[model samples]
Target chain A: RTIKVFTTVDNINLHTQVVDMSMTYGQQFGPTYLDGADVTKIKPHNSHEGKTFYVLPNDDTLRVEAFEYYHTTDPSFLGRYMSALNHTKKWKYPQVNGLTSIKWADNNCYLATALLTLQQIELKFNPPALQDAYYRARAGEAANFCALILAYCNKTVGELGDVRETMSYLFQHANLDSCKRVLNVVCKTCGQQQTTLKGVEAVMYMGTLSYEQFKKGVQIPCTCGKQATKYLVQQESPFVMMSAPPAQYELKHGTFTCASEYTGNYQCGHYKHITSKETLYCIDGALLTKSSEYKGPITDVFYKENSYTTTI
Target chain B: RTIKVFTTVDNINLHTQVVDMSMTYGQQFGPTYLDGADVTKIKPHNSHEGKTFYVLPNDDTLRVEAFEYYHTTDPSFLGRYMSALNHTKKWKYPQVNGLTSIKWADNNCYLATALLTLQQIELKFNPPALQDAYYRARAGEAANFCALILAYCNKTVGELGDVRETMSYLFQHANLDSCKRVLNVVCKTCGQQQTTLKGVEAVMYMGTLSYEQFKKGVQIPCTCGKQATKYLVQQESPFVMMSAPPAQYELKHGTFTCASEYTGNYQCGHYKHITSKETLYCIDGALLTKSSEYKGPITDVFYKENSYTTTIKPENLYF
Candidate 1:
């Protein structure tokens, strides 16, 4: 395939400078590459442009394979990948460089691969400013880093369960501003920036979605399903309410919607009933027994207690 | 001078059942009485029937007055008077006293004298409740305590200046409940049991007389005064207002009147002007200085510094 010799890749041009690795650091004769073969002497004819490889002057550093010489002086994972590809069999140089230099790195694919790998490693620590680096790195013609991080983060989130649980985790782990960054980065990566995701998509990626997207996806999921939106899941969970009810009792239906076929444990006191019985009793939701009125000081406060409308 | 057998003297009556002073621990000491000769031992001659004094068969305690005794066991002066007059000098055996027994103790005049003296002494210490005892001692007969306390209280009060100021002082020192008692006792003493004193009179004696007498006397203490009736000596002496001009501020001409005739301090600001302007140029109470409108940070918040009333988030622009 003919690689376009456009002005740049990731906004960097093709003529960008590369480091000279085969220098005088190793004081000895060394084998050079000629068509994937290592040799003590390279034929003058093969020394023609693109016909030869320059041998590493020392082996006191990471060695790369002779045929595909990809390398960098950076010792990070991406550097590891590049260094292994440029691994030398023998040399005498003590590698003490932070400058990333690659020889014969012909086009954008190899460069993009290296940059994406390094981006992943950089964020592996979850730095607060990481996503800025993600966008900055992807600002030009590259999409690999954003794409890959979204994939891995979505997978990591999906395996854990509910969107609420996922969000709950993010709330504890990431501060609000960082969570917003997550949302923007994921949406932009998924090429779904202006459009919102579906319910299940949100469950897996809710931490990485804006409030509007989250709320839209929240309307339909039931706590019983994998696609259960955070809305229903929240019903199963407890939260603070403003106050206790009237002392003088009044009959009323509760607010959660549970399975129609089930009557046992499936329920919630905070949402409309979605059951066949559909009849939500006030006593059940109040968690009180029949013919009884709760005059006891249940609590001076409203706190978490499970109440139900016969969903199970 | 023969003392009457059954009659009253010191707001108290003779034959008023006085306790015998020299009676038995249990021994009997019968009746006793006056004799002849300021020193006459009229010879046990009248010891028969109404002519005789019963003899006490024992010596129980206190002796009555021989000549002119006056004393009180009660710390109060009146009680001192009652106790003293009943003192017996030398009874034939021991006086079996059943008479106010002190002869020539005189009429309401003597009793009144003793009571008034006691009333004065009782109040000398300024005890708040003792005067009630003075009147109670004389409950049926007179108005000595009520009458005199007013004269003195008014004198005390009038000297301090304004009736209002005096009222204010009385208000501070006297408890309101006691003032209620003052009203009741004064009314009862004035014998205005059912009748009422008039309005202006009410103000004056409301402090000294009974409520009824006060309401009655209250008649025309004309706001006009000497110009009015006997009603108000009050302002003339701060007893009450119903009286005069300059009696001009006459409740009439008011504070503004003293003026143009004089301007210079013809003034009052806060409420009452207290000085001489000799030029109070309508400082007109600062009603708010005008002729100009200025927008400036006149007061600070918690801090003494003026912070411009705007902050960012709303708009970075002052306009």
Candidate 2:
């Protein structure tokens, strides 16, 4: 590895200075949108540099071009991965947000992280007018802290576990339990500088390889191995009926599949033959047995238990 | 031992209706407020003939009045506790408030619980009007369920624990770094119920107990404790003044005691040497070698290092 120069490991200080200046710049500029004009003219002078891009397509030929002169300290995770806000609603980014029940929550954290990253990158690479070094460093630190907390890519399974577990503990556990010293320290340490996450390469390489192995090696339940037949018995009723033999009780719209080689409705009830001859449903000498229907799903709720399902 | 039976409970169904009615009749007319102003209006009815002057004062002062009624079922823990609510705020017997905090998260839960309690109690006991029995049962179940959840002063400590932990985990831990499952089940439990609480007992008991514990048990270092002389070698300061044979370092406000213990300049920096070691300005003694002044309810907080107090943690930058 080449020896490092130009970047201090204590980049938070520098990053915070950049953010303060950028925020001040944004405040002075106010809303970048204009009343009416082209998209380029509408955006602020330096802010629109790289962001102003175009896509061209002719039948099979499609091309995308991006330009960003001013990146931000806060670019959300969703923005990093999907970039297109509109696609989120259509459930386009399944790979990124597949497991998330609530997308907006993830989106908010991602946005906060992105903003911190943008702030850090800009603080380091791009220089704006009259930077307030102190404020920049402080804000940079805070932003980086948030970014780490709301980590973006989540390229590993263990990370996912930690996200849910740690997040769960934080949200649920003792609120006043921790010492004030610990909390204040956390706030301070986080304020050092915005973490200039060059990319996912550093974080992923060290901690993520095991996760990749886990995903590939881990064996989840294969639907075929655990398959079994459930026999559901219905007390003979006037309304209930069976189509094929009209005796082996397989209620309609009840059980979808049967055991072994047979695959259709049997009689309303199964009756064993008294003679030495055993009756076989499958003519081709295929192994078969009478199986009844199964109700949809099982529930633990009492009081209204009977009404909930036909059978477990 | 003869048990006091009264019938203030309202029965509606085989499960709840009978139990409720038994409780109502078992409680009969509670203290003075259970029947509102109607309590005093009536004496013993003919149906209560064999009761033989059942209402009698327990003590000589007549502070404890007793009444007996008949009941088939045993009163539940909650039912008996709630009976005290019969004595309204006016009578000072026992003011009643449904501890809605269990089911109540904010003001909305508060108002909802209050209004519902008013309607629920009325509908349960002496109904002002004839209403649909089915509707009454549903409302009663909701109220009862809510009460069941909050009987221990509203929010079930368990559920509260979960809620707090989960929210913290989500907000603080962020990704999967740490603190996930703590509050995962806060609002997710089916235990949502309006807590039935007696206002008089609750307010007096809870508030007083908590305040007392906070004041005494916290022990945020008073001025009274083990004392020792120390030196404050200030990085830049040059002036050092000590009485006679020079006592040790000066005790400033920040060096000891948290905000709660802080009281004006006394708890701040000023320290009078109780120790009597020959005088500095020839007042005979600086009162240096004494015990009383040095020991009195003293507490120090910053025993451990505080990161916020420091400037920075030098990054390893050895990438």
Candidate 3:
């Protein structure tokens, strides 16, 4: 297998030199293999040639292995040369850095893994230029990060501002705590099932009800597997009526008079007979069997018992 | 002066009612004053009539004063009626609200003060509906918020996504630490003066130099007024040459041969007596007066000595 290596010297004369070399499995790399015909041509004037050099690998496992090899073998290896190595610099040739064990089927996952590894390397290297380069590459690969985050949140990228800027902001602001909060909000919002219904029967009883009891009483299913602690109910037009208890005797002969006048030309006359099969509505334990309609501007607000949790 | 009061009874029979009442300065409010002719008209059927009630104010100073008055005077008055008050709900009538003391000349500042007061109220009330309503109002007033933040950052609204969504995200993600970091970046970026120059001479020396000496030696002025600890240098086409020290003896008649071949048909020739007034460049104390031009694709990167503090991953590359 062949691997393309990018080497840079601290001296001003040398450019960022690139060379390709061939090696078999389990074979270790040395300066002889690293330096090709180019070093031979510059051997006359090059002062720092063949004295000491550092190698940086794109993959972590390879880097660790290479570091271990150099530490045990060469005294001049100089313990993992740490500098601002641009991880996203395009190679003129294909990179076969022995990352064949990992499957790169998902482009986003692969890109994320590479970027995360690069970020870890930057942290370990502790170079500002490397950090800047990592962020620039991150900004370049923003479509992948944005895709991953949006997929996790079940949201579309267009819902955000400029896709690159949004992702860049997220990456810049990202930390363990913030990521935790972001995940919490994602779980809550994704777990919620919002639906609007009309003509649903709600028993208008006095006093308050627990969330569970209200959910069951109203026959609203908790599609979200989690135990629901809060709910919202909105109605277009609200109707309330008060009726007498069922145990009372039926009025068969007497005329029942209306106590209060009704709105919109509804008659205030009496009924000849009253039956006990009427629906009951209670407000402050008052029973009058009078129907009252809210005749005002409609404002559809969810009827929450106490307060619902606000997703972050 | 008069203020419009929004009152609601806990009982389901009553709706959120609006009423306009007249009052003078330092006038103490009472239950008798709050209950208008509407309460008198509903006296026949209303069971919770005149039992107890709460008043919510849009402004904080008025709320505190009214709470004080109610607490001292009315025994039936609760400490404060805390509930979800729709701050952005449009009133059919104009709201005097006794806020005449504060100048509402700047609409944005007025809106911000009102929203901030409402947010504080929400925090004190600890109501989820109030929090939700506050956020909803915040979302509704995003244009103002966006304008404020962008103005502070010296950015434009068009640079962001949906103005509302962007502001909502900022407000939602906003906190003390994050805001501090944001302000730090803003200050650093705004303080920086970025300029690119061509044909600027940079002396090539062997050893390293301090940031201050580098600035002074390169004749670059520090205009930021802050102590600059680092700098960046980018060259379009880099030229490097090596020359002997000025005190070295000058040859009168010998030919100074070219040690290295020149690129692009530049002839290697013999020079007669060279003068002492010549530019000197050094590379590791080796002094051969030969110029070598870098012939490659240009990749301009800033020459940072150690590391520069990343301004939230640095705003822009100097190159």
Best by lDDT: 3
Alpha-carbon deviation at B187 in model 3, angstroms: 21
What is the i-RMS of every prediction?
57.4, 31.9, 25.7
Clash count in backbone of candidate 3: 2
Better of 1 and 2 by TM-score: 2
Model 2 chain B worst lDDT run, 10 consecutive residues: B179-188
> After superposition, which runs of candidate 1 have C-alpha atoms over 4 Å from their true positions?
A1-60, A63-211, A216-227, A231-312, B1-319
Docking class of 1: incorrect
Candidate 3, residues A1-312, lDDT tens digits: the string is 233333422211222333323221111222211221212111122334333333323245444454443222212221112200111122111212211111222222223323322322212212232233345444453332223333222233223222122223333322212111000111242454444322212212211122233332222112343223333333222221112111112221111211111112111111111111132111111112323221211111112222223322
Candidate 1 lDDT, A52-117, residue by residue in tens: 233432333223221112222211222112222233211111111211211211212222223322
What's the lDDT for residue A141 in model 3? 33
Residue-wise C-alpha lDDT for candidate 2, range A262-302, written one tens digit per residue: 12211111111110012212111111223233221110000
Give a tens-digit lDDT track for model 2, residues B1-319: 1233233222210011111222333254333213223333343443532222212121211110010111111122223323322222122111112111112222122222222222322112111111232143244323332222232122331222211122222122112121111000001111111111111111111111122122222222213762211111111111101111112232332222110111123222221111112211101011112221232222111111111111211121111
lDDT of 3 at A229: 31
lDDT of 1 by residue, B1-319 (tens): 1211221112221222322223321122233333211112232221222332222211101111100111111112222222222331211111111101112111122222223222222112133332343444443322333222323233221121222222322222222221111111111111111111222222233221222222233332313542111111111111221211111121111111111011211131111111112222111121212221122211100001111111222121112
- What's the C-alpha lDDT at position B255 in model 3? 20
Q: For model 3, how does the per-residue alpha-carbon lDDT over B1-319 read when each residue is reduced to its tens digit?
A: 2233334322111223323333321132223112212232222223333333333222222232332222111112221122101211221112122111112222222233323223221122222323333454444533322233333223332231222222232333222121110001112322322222111122122212222233322223236563322333332222211222122232221122111111121122111111111221111111223223212111111121222223223234221
